[PDB]
Design a protein around this ligand. Structure first.
Ligand SMILES: *[C@@H]1O[C@H](CO)[C@@H](O[C@@H]2O[C@H](CO)[C@@H](O)[C@H](O)[C@H]2NC(C)=O)[C@H](O)[C@H]1NC(C)=O
Ligand SMILES: *[C@@H]1O[C@H](CO)[C@@H](O)[C@H](O)[C@H]1NC(C)=O
Ligand SMILES: *[C@@H]1O[C@H](CO)[C@@H](O)[C@H](O)[C@H]1NC(C)=O
Ligand SMILES: *[C@@H]1O[C@H](CO)[C@@H](O)[C@H](O)[C@H]1NC(C)=O
Ligand SMILES: *[C@@H]1O[C@H](CO)[C@@H](O)[C@H](O)[C@H]1NC(C)=O
Ligand SMILES: *[C@@H]1O[C@H](CO)[C@@H](O)[C@H](O)[C@H]1NC(C)=O
Lengths: 50, 211
């Protein structure tokens, strides 16, 4: 799952079987880390129109 | 015997977390308010078809239902899945067994694996080569029948076992009551709540208001 974003710890209470979360646009929006098994938030890095 | 399943037998359809969304999915599910065949721990262990996939449940008080068998013909001509629960172990096997003519639990192989006031609920299904199990345990307020209320089952395991299952059976302990229902391909709308609990669902093919 290649992608550009800020990673953080989250309030996303994943159930024990869940590996990912998604937005409406199908884009992944949280991930379980495959080594430390914690539930990372993904936010696309701070952006806006100029 | 027969009885109404109410809104039971919904389960988490994929390993993706979602919350605050009403999500459309098409998969094998138990149709809402469908007839489920009903059976007892006293006297009652017939072999049933498996079809597309089996919803199974038991209403319970002392853990009498303890396993299942799945296959074509249960007679060593081919692989048959066996599942058993015993204390700290949950056990899974797929050798070409020959079983008893009347199976019970007294208190060329390919794979092996190891991990009323109670209601135990399960879904068993196949996806080409892969067998999946989902489950829930809940309290129930009354002995009578399956609750007229909503709860979603969660995946236990996936088995890469590739069996052509067309029939199944369940195993009783000897020194409760149990149900069978069949899944169908249904479009469903699933209510993932603000925490990602599936708190409600619509079976879209039930009635014109569900459509
Ligand atoms: C899966 O098992 C079923 C039997 O439970 C097989 O179905 C039979 O297949 C033969 C030909 O092989 C037909 O003549 C019969 O009419 C079928 N019976 C039923 C009830 O469908 C099926 O072929 C098996 N499939 C595989 C891939 O093993
Ligand atoms: C992966 O390795 C780290 C050390 O590099 C270890 O702390 C962690 O527990 C391991 N995780 C798994 C899932 O084995
Ligand atoms: C349930 O099955 C019986 C026959 O066993 C049938 O008469 C009845 O109409 C069915 N009810 C529903 C709700 O499907
Ligand atoms: C469970 O049953 C298996 C045989 O099917 C046995 O090998 C295992 O030791 C048992 N475990 C317990 C906790 O009794
Ligand atoms: C195992 O499979 C081969 C065919 O691949 C067959 O000839 C043999 O008889 C089988 N053995 C048993 C014990 O069923
Ligand atoms: C949502 O989750 C929190 C803990 O994160 C819990 O306290 C609360 O009761 C939950 N509410 C619902 C409606 O599930």
């Amino acid at each position: 799952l290649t992608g550009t974003g800020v990673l953080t710890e989250s309030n996303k209470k994943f159930l024990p079987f869940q590996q990912f979360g998604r937005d409406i646009a199908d884009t992944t929006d949280a991930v379980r880390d495959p080594q430390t098994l914690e539930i990372l938030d993904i936010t696309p890095c701070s952006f806006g129109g100029v | 015997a027969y009885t109404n399943s109410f809104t039971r037998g919904v389960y988490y359809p994929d390993k993706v977390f979602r919350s605050s969304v009403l999500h459309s999915t098409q998969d094998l599910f138990l149709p809402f308010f469908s007839n489920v065949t009903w059976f007892h721990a006293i006297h009652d262990n017939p072999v049933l078809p498996f079809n597309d996939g089996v919803y199974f449940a038991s209403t319970e008080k002392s853990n009498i239902i303890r396993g299942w068998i799945f296959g074509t013909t249960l007679d060593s001509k081919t692989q048959s899945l066996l599942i058993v629960n015993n204390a700290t172990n949950v056990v899974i096997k797929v050798c070409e067994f020959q079983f008893c003519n009347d199976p019970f639990l007294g208190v060329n192989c390919t794979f092996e694996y190891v991990s009323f006031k109670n209601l135990r609920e399960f879904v068993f299904k196949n996806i080409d080569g892969y067998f999946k199990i989902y489950s829930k345990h809940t309290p129930i307020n009354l002995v009578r029948d399956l609750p007229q209320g909503f709860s979603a089952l969660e995946p236990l395991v996936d088995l890469p076992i590739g069996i052509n299952i067309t029939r199944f059976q369940t195993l009783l302990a000897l020194h409760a009551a149990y149900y069978v229902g069949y899944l169908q391909p249904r479009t469903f709308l699933l209510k993932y709540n603000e925490n990602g609990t599936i708190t409600d669902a619509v079976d879209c093919a039930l009635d014109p208001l569900s459509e």
